[PDB]
Each structure stands twice: as structure tokens, then as C-alpha cells.
């Protein structure tokens, strides 16, 4: 039971760390997608200006 409890707390803390590592890539790809959209903005504007 000692081993099971320590394994539970270890897996719990690793799960939280992995949650953080994952939301990291989440927000990174989110800012990248926003950047791509703002980039499409100027070209879609110029395509109408011209």
C-alpha cells in the first residue's frame, strides 16, 4: 500500500506536468494559427484593392 500510494502521487504529479507541457504546445499553435490568419488578412485585402 505504501508503494501504491507513492506511485499514485508520482503518476498524479507527472500527469499535471504533462497537462502543462501539452497546453504549452496548445497556446503555441494557437498564436501560430492567429498569425497565419492575420497574414491571410493583408493578402485578401490587396486582392480586392487591386
Amino acid at each position: 500500500l505504501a508503494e501504491a500510494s507513492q506511485a499514485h502521487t508520482k503518476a498524479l504529479e507527472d500527469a499535471k506536468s504533462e497537462a502543462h507541457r501539452v497546453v504549452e504546445e496548445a497556446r503555441t499553435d494557437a498564436e501560430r494559427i492567429a498569425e497565419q490568419l492575420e497574414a491571410q488578412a493583408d493578402v485578401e485585402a490587396e486582392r480586392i484593392k487591386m
Binding site: 485578401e44 485585402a45 480586392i48 484593392k49
Partner: protein, 50 residues
């Protein structure tokens, strides 16, 4: 998008009347040059300067 296309519609609203002003301004100018064109057309149809 909608900003760009509505403001280029505004630029069209301006350019239409501007170019129409240019057109009816040159309409009175071209009338001075009709005589020479008429004379040369008649000369080419007939074959003499008159």
C-alpha cells in the same frame, strides 16, 4: 474584407464622377480637332487635297 471592399466601393464612387468630369471636359476639346479629321477623310475617299 468588408472594410476593404466597402472603401474601394467609396473609391469607385469618387473615381466615377471624377473620370466623367474628365470626359465631358475633353468632349469640348476634341471638337476642335474634328475638322482636320474630316478633311483628311474626304481627301482619302476622293484622292485629292480638297
Amino acid at each position: 474584407r468588408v472594410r476593404a471592399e466597402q472603401q474601394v466601393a467609396s473609391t469607385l464612387q469618387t473615381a466615377h464622377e471624377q473620370l466623367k468630369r474628365e470626359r465631358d471636359a475633353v468632349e469640348l476639346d476634341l471638337r476642335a480637332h474634328v475638322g482636320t479629321m474630316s478633311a483628311t477623310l474626304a481627301s482619302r475617299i476622293l484622292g485629292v487635297d480638297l
